[PDB]
């Protein structure tokens, strides 16, 4: 039950490593999961719905990791605080490159996928702005841009830059340089006069 | 000749303001341009090719504006230098929101559109890095990140952030705040220790 379901999800994530969702069939997913096509339709209405569930898992995994961090302060300078936070997204999405890639592309064709990204990005921006505000209240960060607007641009930078790196797009920051690149821009823009 | 062609381009840009390219027909474009469908096929192979030509015009317009700037230094602080430069992209693409939007979306489905964006973004990143390097050589900017990697992330930030603003995406920086937001992040990340 949960097992045929997990098998479908696992097969899907595996096949997305070798080709886009458009070139993966329900027959492909049913075969890999060791079920029939009708049985597949019991668990999911479409291959699109399978991707939505995989994305939902990855996004929630990042979100839960960030919550864990937010409850367990690492005893560290402000630079490492931001780095450890950005690193949740670098490792979580970077550990699931095929779902990241397919799920980013599905934003264009799926209202549910677009709304999932939007909902979480809104949450992560709100948390970023809350942390900036705390830094300003403690006198460590200067009162420059509206915190929520700065948070929005930094979050959108990370989305575009991380995913371009993972995809090896031209242009992109090399994956082995992208964390240091983003941390630098976050720290200088949050603390800089 | 060039006139039926310009009419097709103008009709296309006008119709893209009210709906996506998928919901615009060649009949729609031929009618608006006051020609027949066969005559249309003389000027362009597809509605896709029409969008590519419109994008090509917008991208080259931004590029030519930047070249103009690069030959005519405004007598100004470093902050206004970067602002005037970012503003080329804000005004050029923001003056052509429907082509920007459709052309951004076509990256997913058109190798020629993806390669056009890539080619120009590579040029703009190279120029950004050249300016940063000049700032470092004159002793105004510190030698922090590799210039080309910093340039890449700042350019990708601007792409994602400007286009989200123009589209009114959730989340996005309000359009009336996006220039100041980007300039702040550019200046603090380029000059900041
Ligand atoms: C899809 C994208 C992926 C990249 N992304 C991202 O790196 N945000 C960083 C969020 C963050 C870092 C440090 C402290 C708090 C905090 F919220 C947003 C979502
Ligand atoms: C599609 C995107 C749109 C946004 N974008 C962009 O703002 N780049 C800024 C480029 C720049 C600014 C100042 C000086 C030199 C310089 F090159 C890149 C391309």
What is the residue-wise DSSP string for B112-155? HHHHHHHHHHHHHHHHHHHHHHHHHHTTSS---S-HHHHHHHHH
Residue A96 dihedral angles phi and psi, to the nearest 5°: -135, 60
Collapse the DSSP code of B63 into the 3-class scheme (helix H, G, I; strand E, B; otherwise coil) and give the result.
helix
Q: Are residues B70 and B163 in the same domain?
A: yes
> Distance between CA B63 and CA B123 in Å, rounded?
9
Q: Are residues B166 and B152 in the same domain?
A: yes
Burial class (CB in 10 A: 0-12, 13-18, 19+), B34: exposed
> Distance between CA B135 and CA B141 in Å, rounded?
5
Q: Are residues A1 and A72 in the same domain?
A: no
CA nearest to B56, candidates B67, B64, B68: B64
> Distance between CA A19 and CA B39 in Å, rounded?
39
- The DSSP code sequence of B81-104 is HHHHHHHHHHHHHHTSHHHHHHHH
> Distance between CA A109 and CA A102 in Å, rounded?
11
Give the number of domains in chain B.
Answer: 2
Question: Residue B151 is encoded by which pair of tokens?
Answer: 């340039």
> Distance between CA B28 and CA B11 in Å, rounded?
9
Torsion sign across C-alpha atoms B56, A171, B112, A14? negative
Q: Are residues A23 and A76 in the same domain?
A: no
Q: Are residues A136 and A180 in the same domain?
A: yes
Q: Are residues B59 and B123 in the same domain?
A: yes
Q: Are residues A39 and A83 in the same domain?
A: no
> Distance between CA A175 and CA A183 in Å, rounded?
14
Strands (E), B13-93: none
CA nearest to B177, candidates B193, B190, B192, B164: B164
Question: Residue A99 is encoded by which pair of tokens?
Answer: 């779902």
Using CA coordinates, name the residue in chain A closest to B101: A108
Separation of CA B85 and ligand 2 centre (Å): 7
> Distance between CA B48 and CA A136 in Å, rounded?
49
Specify whether the CB–CB gap between A140 and A178 falls below 8 A. Answer: no
Specify whether the CB–CB gap between A120 and A59 falls below 8 A. Answer: yes
Q: Are residues A7 and A98 in the same domain?
A: no
By residue count, chain B amounts to: 193
Which residue range is the domain that position B3 belongs to?
1-46
CA nearest to A186, candidates A166, A158, A163, A148: A158
Peptide bond into B171 cis (omega under 30): yes
Ligand 1 atom closest to Cα of residue A59: 1
The residue of A78, A101, A152 whose CB has the most chain B CBs within 10 angstroms, and thus the best one to mutate to test that interface, is A152
Residue A161 contacts by C-beta under 8 Å, 6 or more apart in sequence? A172, A173, A178, A181, A182, B152, B153, B156, B157
> Distance between CA B25 and CA B61 in Å, rounded?
27
Residue B172 contacts by C-beta under 8 Å, 6 or more apart in sequence? A152, A156, B161, B164, B165
Q: What is the resolution of this structure in A?
A: 1.7
Q: Which residue has its alpha carbon closest to ligand 1 atom 1?
A: A159
Separation of CA B118 and ligand 2 centre (Å): 13
Could you say which ligand is closest to the alpha carbon of residue B94?
Answer: 2
Separation of CA A139 and ligand 2 centre (Å): 33
Question: Residue B162 is encoded by which pair of tokens?
Answer: 């400007």
Angle between helix A47-71 and A97-106 (nearest 10): 110
Angle between helix B97-106 and B47-71 (nearest 10): 110
The CB density around residue A107, as the number of other CB atoms within 10 Å, is 18
Q: Please give, rounded to a whole number of angstroms, the shortest distance from the CA of A76 to a CA of chain B.
A: 19
Specify whether the CB–CB gap between B155 and B130 falls below 8 A. Answer: no
Q: Are residues B69 and B148 in the same domain?
A: yes
State whether the beta carbon of A127 lies less than 6 angstroms from ligand 1. yes
> Distance between CA A73 and CA A52 in Å, rounded?
32
Separation of CA A30 and ligand 1 centre (Å): 35
Q: Are residues A62 and A42 in the same domain?
A: no
CA angle B147/B66/B16 to nearest 5° reads 110
CA angle B121/B50/B30 to nearest 5° reads 165
CA nearest to A148, candidates B168, B174, B187: B174
Specify whether the CB–CB gap between A181 and A173 falls below 8 A. Answer: yes
Specify whether the CB–CB gap between B132 and B85 falls below 8 A. Answer: no
Report how far apart, in Å, the C-alpha atoms of A115 and of each of A122, B14, B170 are.
10, 28, 9
Give the HSE-up count for residue B114: Cα atoms under 13 Å, Cβ half-sphere: 9
Specify whether the CB–CB gap between A189 and B189 falls below 8 A. Answer: yes
Q: A140-153: b or e for each residue (b if 16 or more CB lie within 10 Å)?
A: ebeebbbbbbbbbb
Q: Are residues A134 and A165 in the same domain?
A: yes
Kind plus residue range of the DSSP H or E element containing A176? helix A175-191
Ligand 1 probe mutation, A60, A80, A81, A86, most atoms within 8 A of CB? A86
> Distance between CA B108 and CA B144 in Å, rounded?
34
Q: Are residues B20 and B82 in the same domain?
A: no
* Greatest Cα-to-Cα distance within chain A, rounded to the nearest angstrom: 62
Ligand 1 atom closest to Cα of residue A182: 7
Please judge whether A181 and B145 are an interchain contact, meaning their C-beta atoms are less than 8 angstroms apart.
Answer: yes
CA nearest to B88, candidates B15, B188, B155: B155
Kind plus residue range of the DSSP H or E element containing A108? none
Which residues does chain A have within 8 Å of residue B118's beta carbon, measured at their own beta carbons?
A: 169-171
Specify whether the CB–CB gap between A165 and A178 falls below 8 A. Answer: yes
> Distance between CA A152 and CA A120 in Å, rounded?
12
């Amino acid at each position: 039950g949960d097992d045929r379901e997990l098998a479908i999800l696992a097969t899907a994530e595996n096949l997305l490593e070798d080709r886009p969702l458009a070139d993966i069939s329900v027959d492909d997913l049913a075969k890999g999961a060791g079920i029939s096509r009708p049985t597949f339709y019991f668990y999911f209405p479409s291959k699109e719905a399978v991707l939505l569930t995989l994305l939902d898992r990855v996004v929630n995994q990042a979100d839960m990791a960030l919550q864990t961090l937010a409850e367990n302060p690492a005893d560290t300078d402000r630079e490492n605080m931001w780095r450890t936070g950005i690193n949740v997204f670098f490792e979580t999405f970077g550990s699931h490159k095929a779902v990241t890639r397919a799920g980013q592309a599905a934003r264009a064709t799926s209202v549910e996928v677009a709304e999932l990204w939007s909902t979480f990005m809104q949450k992560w921006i709100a948390y970023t702005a809350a942390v900036i505000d705390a830094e300003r209240d403690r006198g460590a960060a200067p009162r420059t841009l509206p915190a929520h607007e700065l948070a929005t641009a930094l979050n959108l930078m990370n989305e575009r830059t991380l995913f371009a790196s993972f995809a090896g797009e031209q242009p992109s920051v090399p994956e082995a340089r992208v964390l240091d690149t983003l941390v630098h821009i976050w720290v200088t823009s949050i603390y800089g006069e």
